[PDB]
Paper text:
EfeUOB/M has been characterised in Pseudomonas syringae pathovar. syringae as a novel type of ferrous-iron transporter, consisting of an inner-membrane protein (EfeUPsy) and three periplasmic proteins (EfeOPsy, EfeMPsy and EfeBPsy). EfeMPsy is an ‘M75-only’ EfeO-like protein with a C-terminal peptidase-M75 domain (EfeOII/EfeM family). Here we report the X-ray structure determination and bioanalytical characterisation of EfeMPsy from Pseudomonas syringae pv. syringae B728a; an EfeM family member that shares ~ 60% sequence identity with EfeO of E. coli K-12 in an effort to understand the role of this protein family member in the EfeUOB/M systems in bacteria. The work reported here introduces EfeMPsy as the best candidate to mark the beginning of the journey for a more detailed understanding of the periplasmic components, EfeO (EfeOI family) and EfeM (EfeOII family) and thereby offers support for the suggestion that these proteins contribute to iron transport in the EfeUOB(M) system, acting as periplasmic iron-binding proteins.
Herein, we report a structure solution of the apo form of EfeMPsy by molecular replacement. The refined structure of EfeMPsy consists of two identical EfeMPsy monomers (chain A, residues A35-A285, and chain B, residues B35-B285) in the asymmetric unit. Close examination of the overall structure shows that EfeMPsy is composed of two major α-helical bundles designated as ‘B1’ and ‘B2’. A flexible loop (residues 162–165, highlighted as ‘IDH’ in Fig. 1a) separates the B1 (residues 36–161) and B2 bundles (residues 166–285). Comparison of the folds (EfeMPsy vs pSBPs) suggests that some of the key structural characteristics of pSBPs are retained by EfeMPsy; the presence of two discrete domains linked by a hinge region, and the presence of an inter-domain ligand-binding cleft. Moreover, the inter-domain hinge region of EfeMPsy is smaller, consisting of only four residues which may reflect the relative size of ligand, in this case a metal ion, and potentially the lack of necessity to undergo any substantial opening/closing of the cleft to facilitate ligand binding. In this work, a closer examination of the structure of EfeMPsy has revealed two potential metal binding sites. The metal binding cleft, Site III, is nestled in between the two alpha helix bundles B1 and B2. Based on these observations, arising from the crystal structure, up to five residues (Tyr82, His126, Glu129, Glu189 and Asp190) can be considered potential metal ligands at Site III.Assessment of the structure for other potential metal binding sites, suggests a potential second metal binding site for these EfeO/EfeM family of proteins.
Numbering used by the authors:
A (entry chain A), B (entry chain B): 35 to 285
The structure:
Amino acid sequence: ATAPLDLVGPVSDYKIYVTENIEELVSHTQKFTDAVKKGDIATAKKLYAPTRVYYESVEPIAELFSDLDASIDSRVDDHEQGVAAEDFTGFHRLEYALFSQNTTKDQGPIADKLLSDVKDLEKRVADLTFPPEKVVGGAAALLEEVAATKISGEEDRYSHTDLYDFQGNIDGAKKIVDLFRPQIEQQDKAFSSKVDKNFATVDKILAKYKTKDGGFETYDKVKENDRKALVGPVNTLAEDLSTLRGKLGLN
Amino acid sequence: ATAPLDLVGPVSDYKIYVTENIEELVSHTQKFTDAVKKGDIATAKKLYAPTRVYYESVEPIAELFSDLDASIDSRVDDHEQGVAAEDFTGFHRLEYALFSQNTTKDQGPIADKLLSDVKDLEKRVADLTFPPEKVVGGAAALLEEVAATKISGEEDRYSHTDLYDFQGNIDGAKKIVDLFRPQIEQQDKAFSSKVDKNFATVDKILAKYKTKDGGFETYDKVKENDRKALVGPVNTLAEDLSTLRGKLGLN
């Protein structure tokens, strides 16, 4: 097995990456929740998806905090009581108010809780010794999440900003693969190029829906043939990435 | 003496009719909310629409208590926050849990409040001096509600039991027309025959969707031809019935 300290290079660089994304998450969530508290629906809607990109890019770490992640990011699908669940809070609760209902009424406390929760997450990440097995395992976890809910447009059922989250997951996974390139190369000379090709295929389909202002079209614009073309490469990436924990001597 | 055709007669009889329906509403609501608290989803679903018929038949009086009516019977449409509104309670809040979400989780307090609210309504109706203009105008008020939400199937957006509510509104309006028939036919017997024929047309179409028990098909079963055939009679009735207050000197 591989001693975690032998992976300090890529693990340290990943914590720097996660920390930078978390700093941006906090600053964007401050602005997003301030807009909600101020009743500025248009500004809140514009900030929603760009803010979430920073969370979706660091899911391998955020999901280590199971209850906090649920507070920040649970979907309607996660609640027996649906949209009416008292425990349905965070981004998707505000997504419903802003995009389906066009309101900020009584959303102030939900916005305040979301800001408090992301500031909590920032502190927990600062305190965290990053386990390389969770980092390395995180790329496969991200691609499994893409396969489960993002290809089908089931992450943002009211704003339909799923492509922002999709691209964030992919970017967060590619970052992990890139950082561990030397360690992968020591055991498997062909692996990085194999996954790079499938990442490039996914990135090219996603790029068909980027906008000049720096965003994405809504999910209803994604053609059925592009949706179908994503399934294969995403599944092959998930399978390939699922071998890395073992290959690198972490489990 | 009191004249034999004095309006104190039919208004008294309407309070009896409303009182009898509210007695049934309380007993059925007890059984409906008991099932919700028990977790018996199948029984609660079967009791939902027959319970509501008694409320829908007396809406001219129930809607005089604005906050109570909202607590018992508001729709998602009535809430800026939609399904997540804390003040979304009563029949349609439980309708969402039972029919959309297939759950009774945490619905106990909502069921307790619905039973308490209909018991409140029962006491308020007993204490109420019925305003004769609200009684006589109640037939038009009910037909306007049919035209606004029942004919288009927008009353029960999760259970789709709108035909029960449709028929209940129609029956409650026909009761008012029948009670004031002696006074109306003093003034305009041709007008009364015109109203009866449109009621008979509506009842004949609705009867096409009755089931073997005193039930109705769900709204999706209503053929588009039968929907368009309902539109004319309902709108003629809404206009004709809007003249009753003036015909009886209550404007």
